[PDB]
């Protein structure tokens, strides 16, 4: 629990956060963990006097003991520069902390109010062309440029991690060079499942499959009165939506028809935590049958299936190996 490159011997004075009282032989002892963000969190508090006077609160902290660093600093209607109150002229309250108990690349990232800019202004030190915030699953899309991408990515994704951690939510970098290509793909190559929803014809499908037909993936919740501005009538199609629900029920029956409900044997691979029936079928399609057979497979061997990712295959292999090794314990 030490620092990065910061190495030295006897006589070197350095502070350390202590909270691990472990009793040993002939009296109890105590250890220190001076490498967490808390130590560097109050580091600015000791320097910046505004932080102690409730003038600049820290939303979150995301530094790298031995690498770079990024913290939160947003004033409460005091109309005062957030980073300007800790730097101003010849910011001596930034370099000091940077090379305090560990030479870290501290990058104070000021926050705004809107959630779109909540991360747009957290790209510093870099620019921002746009933003693709996904308010649903744990996914994001940093929309900047290749020039700043390297500075926005860093080395092992420290910047991304720091940013995401500082923001509190998710944050993933991406390219915007194919902005006129992905758009057509999302409304061109992803338009793929309209015939299954709204009943169509081969001609309408065949010129609307390899290029996308139409319909509305659950688009009935959106206002369909704007489709009345287009030519034609669409009075009965809502009933077809109900037919889609019926098809969904059949799809639900299919969701259980997968290999006659996973045949009947194995049961070890099917009852594994973190894997569904489709994921178990995709994993077992490569010759595996039991959880031990899934543990025998590697991340590269499970990477042949596009349904599983390298991190997900690694987590599944680790879970199967833990179930095999710790099977003696309940």
């Amino acid at each position: 629990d030490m620092l990065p490159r910061e190495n030295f011997r006897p006589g070197d004075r350095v502070r350390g956060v202590l909270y691990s009282v472990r009793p040993e032989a002939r009296g109890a002892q105590l250890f220190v963990t001076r490498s967490k963000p808390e130590m560097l969190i109050e580091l600015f508090r000791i320097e910046v006097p505004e932080i102690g006077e409730e003038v600049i609160e820290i939303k979150a902290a995301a530094r790298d003991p031995g690498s770079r660093a990024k913290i939160a600093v947003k004033t409460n209607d005091k109309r005062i520069d957030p980073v300007g109150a800790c730097v101003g002229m010849r910011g001596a309250r930034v370099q000091a902390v940077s090379t305090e108990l560990g030479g870290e690349r501290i990058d104070i990232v000021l926050w705004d109010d809107n959630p779109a800019q909540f991360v747009i202004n957290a790209m510093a030190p870099a620019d921002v062309a746009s933003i693709v915030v996904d308010e649903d699953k744990h996914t994001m899309d940093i929309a900047v440029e290749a020039g700043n991408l390297a500075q926005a990515i860093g080395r092992n994704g420290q910047n991304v991690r720091l940013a995401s951690q500082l923001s509190g939510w998710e944050l993933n970098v991406m390219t915007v060079d194919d902005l006129q290509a992905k758009h057509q793909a999302e409304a061109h190559a992803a338009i793929d499942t309209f015939t299954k929803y709204l009943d169509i014809d081969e001609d309408f499908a065949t010129v609307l499959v390899e290029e996308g037909f139409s319909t509305l993936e659950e688009l009935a919740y959106v206002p369909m009165k704007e489709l009345l501005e287009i030519e034609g009538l669409d009075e009965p199609t809502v009933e077809a939506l109900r037919e889609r629900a019926k098809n969904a029920l059949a799809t639900i029956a299919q969701a259980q028809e997968e290999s006659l409900g996973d045949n009947k044997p194995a049961d070890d691979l099917l009852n594994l935590e973190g894997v569904d029936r489709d994921l178990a079928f995709k994993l077992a399609a490569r010759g595996v049958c039991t959880l031990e057979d899934l543990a025998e497979q590697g991340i590269d061997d499970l990477a042949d299936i596009e349904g599983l990712t390298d991190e997900k295959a690694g987590a599944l292999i680790m879970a199967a190996r833990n179930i095999c090794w710790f099977g003696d314990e309940a």
Partner: protein, 156 residues
Amino acid sequence: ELQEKLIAVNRVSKTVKGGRIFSFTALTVVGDGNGRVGFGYGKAREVPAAIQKAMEKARRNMINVALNNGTLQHPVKGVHTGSRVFMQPASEGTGIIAGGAMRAVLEVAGVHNVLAKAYGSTNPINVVRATIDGLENMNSPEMVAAKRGKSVEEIL
């Protein structure tokens, strides 16, 4: 990143039973070389402390100014108490043609090119305030368009 200019420092007195207690007032002004400006007026028994106080004051309660490139957007008058101030946008190269306290505020604001006269009083504190007011009131073309319900090309 912020630049800060102490405009003036003045010794002020308070008479008491013993005699005169002296103190010092520091008028400063700070800016980021873009729209943001803020003046601060600090007071203390010793000069440096006073100056520091002024600086602190300045750093909070800043104000934004719409700048068309290096200069102002149109001729603007600003008044405060005795000091009434006129300042007029000017062509690249001309520099800040302005006197005293007024100059300092302009410089920090990141106006590079102005023609500016201070009529009336030239009491630094008042004149800086006046200047600030002038800057503040000054609207941009975009802003005006927004106000009027038009495009920028309609206004020219």
